[PDB]
Amino acid sequence: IKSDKWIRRMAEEHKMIEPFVPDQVRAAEDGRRIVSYGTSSYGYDIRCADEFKIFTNINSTIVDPKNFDEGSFVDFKGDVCIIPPNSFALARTVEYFRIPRTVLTVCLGKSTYARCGIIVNVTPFEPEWEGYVTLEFSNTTPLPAKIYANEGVAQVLFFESDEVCDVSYAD
């Protein structure tokens, strides 16, 4: 696993993460407490942006992962997304990533969300992939649940291999 020193180096020298903060940010401009984001000891706490897609089952009968349909989501833009009970929403990160050929990442939800039964599911970032990261949130509780935009939601952990891969994501 790569360290906070390494993450900093990669952000500043190779634009791995943009926008990037070198430390933990634990409060907003006003001093209001937020779910923290930024560089961590052995990872990076990513933020949720304010554009959400809330799943709706209205007028549908089946979830078909091979036929992803924007029609089964309600667009919501705002500071706090409300996920219906026992259902899910999608969002994207504030951060844009550019992953080196030598790196794979995994991403795990923060305790703030997990402890309330909100499970963030993010798939590994592949070497030479670039993009905003798609976040999914399963609300596994029987009440509506809040997700706070512009604040931390998950921690990305960065692994390097002993061998460069033959075929990267770009190849």
Q: What is the DSSP code string of 48-114?
A: EEEEEEEE--TT-----GGG--GGGEEEEESSEEEEPTTEEEEEEEEEEEE--TTEEEEEEE-HHHH
Number of folded domains in the chain?
1
Convert 94-112 to b/e letters by CB count within 10 Å (16 or more is b).
bbbbbbeebbbbebebbee
As given in the structure block, the two tokens for residue 94 are 């504030």
Is residue 138 within 8 A of residue 76, CB to CB? The reply is no
Residues tagged in the binding site annotation:
110-115, 134-136, 155, 169
| Cα dist from 128 to 100, 156, 168, 171, whole Å | 5, 16, 6, 9
- Which technique? X-ray
Domain at 125, CATH number: 2.70.40.10
Kindly give, in sequence order, each residue whose CB lies less than 8 Å from that of residue 166, ignoring residues fewer than 6 positions away: none
Question: Could you give the CA distance from residue 95 to residue 92 in angstroms, rounded to a whole number?
Answer: 8
Q: Is the peptide bond before 22 cis (omega within 30 degrees of 0)?
A: no
Convert 46-68 to b/e letters by CB count within 10 Å (16 or more is b).
bbbebebbbbeeeeeeeeeeeee
Is residue 158 within 8 A of residue 1, CB to CB? The reply is yes
Residues tagged in the binding site annotation for dCTP:
110-115, 134-136, 155, 169
Kindly give, in sequence order, each residue whose CB lies less than 8 Å from that of residue 106, ignoring residues fewer than 6 positions away: 124, 156, 157, 159
- Residues annotated as part of the active site: 136
3-state secondary structure of 42: coil
Domain region containing 35: 1-171
Is residue 144 within 8 A of residue 165, CB to CB? The reply is no
Is residue 39 within 8 A of residue 56, CB to CB? The reply is no
Question: Could you give the CA distance from residue 6 to residue 107 in angstroms, rounded to a whole number?
Answer: 17
